[PDB]
Amino acid sequence: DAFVGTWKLVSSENFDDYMKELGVGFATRKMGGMAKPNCIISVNGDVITIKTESTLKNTEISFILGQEFDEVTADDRKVKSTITLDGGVLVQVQKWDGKSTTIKRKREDDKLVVECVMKGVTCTRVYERA
């Protein structure tokens, strides 16, 4: 839909503070903060696939809207995730260990804007079509 495509990271705010909230260690934050991932989003039937490629780590999730699924995150957290479409915005919650983080993916102008929230910290990442 508006989300399908290959999307390259062009800007990032507060990603270090977000990773710290996730409990990511210094050495790994350093590497994570300077990688420039590509995100490839596809849809076939009920199933949406989000594949992220970077020099540090790759990840891929496949999901149906509204259906909880198990996911291993790029920092190797084992989480329960649920993604829904809410007024044009893909809203994901990840839950693990009594904790949770929310990730909103939205389409704005020519951008894919991703806002991640954990506790008081809000990180905003912007991707553009590659």
Ligand X SMILES: COCC1(c2nc(C3CCCC3)c(C)c(-c3ccc(F)cc3)c2-c2nnn[nH]2)CCCC1
Taking the C-alpha atoms of residue 21 and residue 57, their distance in angstroms, rounded to an integer, is 19
| Residue 24 in the binding site for ligand X (CB under 6 A) | yes
**Which residues of the chain form beta strands (DSSP E)?**
5-13, 38-44, 47-53, 59-64, 69-72, 78-86, 89-96, 99-108, 111-118, 121-129
Least separation, in Å, of the C-beta of 96 and ligand X? 13
125 is in an annotated binding site: yes
Determine which residue in the list 8, 20, 57, 111 makes contact with ligand X, applying CB under 6 A.
57
Q: Bridge-partner residues for 91, per DSSP?
A: 84, 104
93 is in an annotated binding site: no
Helix axes 26-34 and 15-22, enclosed angle (nearest 10): 140
| Residue 41 in the binding site for ligand X (CB under 6 A) | no
| Residue 112 in the binding site for ligand X (CB under 6 A) | no
Q: Which residues bind ligand X (CB under 6 A)?
A: 19, 24, 28, 32, 35, 37, 39, 52, 54, 56-59, 74-75, 103, 114, 116, 125
Q: Which residues are annotated as a binding site for a fatty acid?
A: 125-127
